[PDB]
């Protein structure tokens, strides 16, 4: 593979369509992901864990905030993810408030 065609996989996964049916959305993916491959901001998994707990208190899913205390431990227990920080920031970024 390469990450450019792997992003095309992501564009097949979010949408429900073939890749010859739409080429606009993959062009939005390559325009935003492109000319950037490396984070230029603070790197720490510990701070984003303390930002996920702080977010789950704000949504009153405070029992799910003690679940994340176990799920981050399970994430450490497998230990086969190279950057734990990028997916935690990514999952933090798409957060919805259903309350």
């Amino acid at each position: 593979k390469s990450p450019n065609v792997l992003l095309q996989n992501l564009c097949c996964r979010i949408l429900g369509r073939s890749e010859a049916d739409v080429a606009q959305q993959f062009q939005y993916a390559v325009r935003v992901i492109g000319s950037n491959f490396a984070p230029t901001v603070e790197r720490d998994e510990f701070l984003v864990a303390e930002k996920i707990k702080k977010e789950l208190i704000r949504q009153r899913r405070e029992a799910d905030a003690a679940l994340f205390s176990e799920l981050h431990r399970k994430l450490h227990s497998q230990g086969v993810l190279k950057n734990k920080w990028s997916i935690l920031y990514l999952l933090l970024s798409l957060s919805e408030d259903p309350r």
Partner: protein, 61 residues
């Protein structure tokens, strides 16, 4: 400067400094403000960093 606070002792004034909570999409500004008393000296053994978190919770309520 505007209120009576300027005249007090420089120690507790200097250790009064502002903090905020770290940005995330959809937050509220009234929650993200806080005041932090910060400790660098030997007084840590009576006001340690694990007691500061309790204080932040108290100040928020």
């Amino acid at each position: 400067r505007a209120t009576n606070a300027q005249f007090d002792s420089p120690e507790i004034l200097r250790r009064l400094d502002v903090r905020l909570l770290e940005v995330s999409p959809g937050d509220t500004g009234w929650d993200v403000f806080s005041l932090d008393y910060h400790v660098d000296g030997p007084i840590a053994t009576v006001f340690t960093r694990e007691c500061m978190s309790h204080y932040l919770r108290v100040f928020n309520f």
